[PDB]
Amino acid sequence: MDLVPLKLVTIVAESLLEKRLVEEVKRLGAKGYTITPARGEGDWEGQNIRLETIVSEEVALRILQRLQEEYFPHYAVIAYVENVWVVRGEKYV
Amino acid sequence: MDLVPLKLVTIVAESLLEKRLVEEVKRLGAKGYTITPARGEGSRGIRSVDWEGQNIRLETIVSEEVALRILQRLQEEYFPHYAVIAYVENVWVVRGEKYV
Amino acid sequence: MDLVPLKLVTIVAESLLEKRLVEEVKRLGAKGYTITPARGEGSEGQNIRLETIVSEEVALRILQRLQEEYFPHYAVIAYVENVWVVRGEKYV
Ligand SMILES: [Cl-]
Ligand SMILES: [Cl-]
Ligand SMILES: [Cl-]
């Protein structure tokens, strides 16, 4: 069993911000990401996306700080982080 | 870095329940929510014409106290009549003070 | 309040793997699951995210099997989170 502790960062925002956000997390160290369509107050196309990425503790805070600084003031964004244990997670570090 | 500890409550149920579940969490104190598609065990996919057979997942960021109020309400009012999944997880949230 | 601690195992993989993965988690002890569409870089010809609430022992059994049988041959992501579940006794 190769299981290691990492962080799962989740971001919810308009789907139109996808390219920018995907670029931001890769730029900050993320080695992958998963997207799920999503919606909120007020159909799965043209709404929001839930972007998730598995990263190390340090990269997680880099991403969150970048979102708080550059995206939160100008867009409706939700961002949070959870603790996870990942199979062969060494690769995401 | 404005990060605070909160709870993420997740509810999975039939799609027709969306309106009532949203009203219910807002009534109990949640300030926002996110809906995503869910299926499995026979349920219909995201592109199906059959909307009734589709499920939805509702996620909401709330305080510890509001989380259990929501979970209790689900256990009392919804679980007895619908196939529902509901759980809670610990999260640290950017600018989370607005969800309390 | 009927709330108990369990584990939430998440697996992201090619959608054609759905059938095999569902059978694998059921075989190893999972008493239910949910599937949600998922897409990654380069976006059916798509992925799925399988989630299952299980006991801590069943979670490790599932993850072990994924590492052995699937990770070497397919592009898969698998992880576990701690969760407290309403009427969770039914998943153990
Ligand atoms: Cl954490
Ligand atoms: Cl918790
Ligand atoms: Cl855990």
Angle at CA C17, nearest 5°, toward C13 and C21?
90
CA B76 to chain CA centroid, nearest Å: 15
Q: Which residue has the tokens 């799925």?
A: C48
Q: Which residues 6+ apart lie within 8 Å of A6 measured at CB? A: A54, A55, A56, A57, A84, A85, A86, A89, A92, A93, C79
Q: Up-side HSE of residue B3: CA atoms within 13 Å toward CB? A: 17
CA distance A46 to chain C (A): 15
Assigned token pair, C29 = 């002890």
User: Which of B39, B66, B85, B90 is most worth mutating to test chain C (most C CB atoms within 10 A of its CB)?
Assistant: B85
DSSP B42: T
Class of domain C2-92: alpha beta
- The answer to whether the CB of A13 falls within 8 A of the CB of A21 is yes
CATH architecture of A2-93: 2-Layer Sandwich (3.30)
B71 → closest Cβ in C1, C22, C81: C1
- The answer to whether the CB of B46 falls within 8 A of the CB of B36 is no
Q: Which helix (H) or strand (E) holds B62?
A: strand B55-62
User: Which of C12, C51, C77, C81 is most worth mutating to test chain A (most A CB atoms within 10 A of its CB)?
Assistant: C77
Resolution of the PDB structure in angstroms: 1.9
Q: Which residues 6+ apart lie within 8 Å of C85 measured at CB? A: B85, B86, B87, C3, C4, C5, C6, C53, C91
Query: What does CATH list as the number for B2-100?
Result: 3.30.70.120
**Separation CA B93–CA A12 (nearest Å):** 12
| Other residues' Cβ atoms within 10 Å of the Cβ of residue C17 | 19
Q: Which residues 6+ apart lie within 8 Å of B31 measured at CB? A: B61, B62, B98, B99
Report the candidate in B80, B31, B84, B28 with the shortest Cα–Cα distance to residue B56: B84
Q: Which residues 6+ apart lie within 8 Å of C87 measured at CB? A: B75, B79, C2
**Separation CA A34–CA A53 (nearest Å):** 6
* Plot region of B65 (φ>0 → left; ψ -120 to 50 → alpha; else → beta): alpha
Residue B6 in 3-state DSSP?
strand
Burial of A31 (0-12, 13-18, 19+ CB in 10 A): middle
DSSP B70: H
Q: Residue type for A84, please? A: V
Query: What single string gives the DSSP state of each residue in C16-75?
Result: GGHHHHHHHHHHTT----EEEEEB-S----SEEEEEEEE-HHHHHHHHHHIIIIITTTS-
- The answer to whether the CB of B1 falls within 8 A of the CB of A61 is yes
Please give the distance, rounded to the nearest whole angstrom, from the Cα atom of residue A7 to the centre of ligand 1: 7
Experimental method of this PDB entry: X-ray
The dihedral over CA atoms of C87, B84, A33, A54, expressed in degrees to the nearest 10, equals -10
3-state percent helix, strand, coil for chain A, nearest multiple of 5: 35, 40, 25
Crossing angle of helices C56-65 and C18-27, rounded to 10° = 140
- The answer to whether the CB of A82 falls within 8 A of the CB of A42 is no
**Separation CA B34–CA A76 (nearest Å):** 12
